[PDB]
Design a binder for this molecule. Structure first.
Ligand SMILES: COc1nc(N2C[C@H]3C(=O)N(C)C(=N)N[C@@]3(c3cc(-c4cccc(C#N)c4)cs3)C2)ncc1F
Length: 387
């Protein structure tokens, strides 16, 4: 229904991630924590670092419990090593509960904490299967549901501003909402459409068709989910498997062919700029991803605009952007590019993910993001990849 205490509890932007305030320990130590549906550990800075202005001080918490076990995470979007323990954890703009949760106290890191970023830790919201060191380390959300009456569901509304936010603006701006234990109807318009969670590890889904401005990419649907397709609030871009990325970029270039962009732009390395207010949104195509429905032989589509896949960056008074669609060798990743267009419901209790048009998506007077259905789609289980 309505969860006013949790609405507008996030801050951040797609390039730096979105974070929520949490407290750890007794007395409570406040930290800003990245909301990550692409991992399953709760890990916090626990030692001084040049890019952290605060960290978890275990010696100052009366409720700290040492698990006497280390944890190592290899190079991904950095690397880190830490020490496992448990403590009492709360979310100030969250459910009014305190839970005893596992915490990885980060003692050493390399390219993990980012200069200029405001988060001090990560809240991995995915399942125990991908937790480190192994699946015996209960993730935060599993603890929260086990210890309280909070329903086994959360929903995310990530809000892209549509323009660059400077150092002060990004700290003062509302970046979105994380509703723990429910769905807030103020955060979306139209209907919610659900896709099954294929398997509980990452939030894995199945894409059954892809269109660029209504034109079918016409690839074998297994290519779209090779080797998996996931929903990840901790990835900035929409990432596509190599072969799919190559086909999609060719189609996006063809649709936008009235303007030529350098190779560096399509590689996501180089910004493109236009005179203030003159970004030619209309030359760029909409992108639709069709997802398996909950009903046999039924699918639905989510449609995003260039206002989602062109990420605003500062250069001048020009309006500049980076192309936020990129190649992957680990499957499709529906990152902040996708999520900024939609209110996303992680319905763990019913093993499904819901999408609805976000009340904060950026658009223009001529086009809007969309969530539509149903469509008749056959042999959708064949779109899933095995081995
Ligand atoms: C903490 O513990 C564990 N974290 C992980 N993760 C895997 C990483 C990764 O490659 N992705 C795709 C991901 N979704 N999350 C991780 C990170 C995201 C960011 C980050 C930085 C800047 C912007 C954004 C955005 N949007 C995200 C830094 S690390 C953490 N894996 C296993 C663990 F035990």
């Amino acid at each position: 229904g309505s969860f006013v205490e949790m609405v507008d509890n996030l801050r951040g932007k797609s390039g730096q991630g979105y974070y929520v305030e949490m407290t750890v320990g007794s007395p409570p130590q406040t930290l800003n924590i990245l909301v990550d549906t692409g991992s399953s550990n709760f890990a916090v800075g626990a030692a001084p670092h040049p890019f952290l202005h605060r960290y978890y001080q275990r010696q100052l918490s009366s409720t700290y419990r040492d698990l006497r076990k280390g944890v190592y995470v290899p190079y991904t979007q950095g690397k880190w090593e830490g020490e496992l323990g448990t403590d009492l954890v709360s979310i100030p703009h969250g459910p009014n509960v305190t839970v005893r949760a596992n915490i990885a106290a980060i003692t050493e890191s390399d390219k993990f904490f980012i200069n200029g970023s405001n988060w001090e830790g990560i809240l991995g919201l995915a399942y125990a299967e991908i937790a480190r060191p192994d699946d015996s380390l209960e993730p935060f959300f599993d603890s929260l549901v086990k210890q309280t009456h909070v329903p086994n569901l959360f929903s995310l509304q990530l809000c892209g501003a549509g323009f660059p936010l400077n150092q002060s603006e990004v700290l003062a701006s509302v970046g979105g909402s994380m509703i723990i234990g429910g769905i807030d109807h103020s955060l979306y318009t139209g209907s919610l459409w659900y896709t099954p969670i294929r398997r509980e590890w990452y939030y894995e889904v199945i894409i059954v068709r892809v269109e660029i401005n209504g034109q079918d990419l016409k690839m074998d649907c297994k290519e779209y989910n090779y080797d998996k397709s996931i929903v990840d609030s901790g990835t900035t871009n929409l990432r596509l498997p190599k072969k799919v990325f190559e086909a999609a970029v060719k189609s996006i270039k063809a649709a936008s062919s009235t303007e030529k962009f350098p190779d560096g732009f399509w590689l996501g390395e180089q910004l493109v700029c236009w005179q203030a207010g003159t970004t030619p949104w209309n030359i760029f195509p909409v992108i639709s991803l069709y997802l398996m429905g909950e009903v046999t032989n039924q699918s639905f589509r989510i449609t995003i605009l260039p206002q989602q896949y062109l990420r605003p960056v500062e250069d001048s008074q020009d309006d500049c952007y980076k192309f936020a669609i990129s190649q992957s060798s680990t499957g499709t990743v529906m990152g902040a590019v996708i999520m900024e267009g939609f209110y996303v419901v992680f319905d763990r209790a019913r093993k499904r993910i819901g999408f609805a048009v976000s009340a904060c998506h950026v658009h223009d007077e001529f086009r809007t993001a969309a969530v539509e259905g149903p469509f008749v789609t056959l042999d959708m289980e064949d779109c899933g990849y095995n081995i």
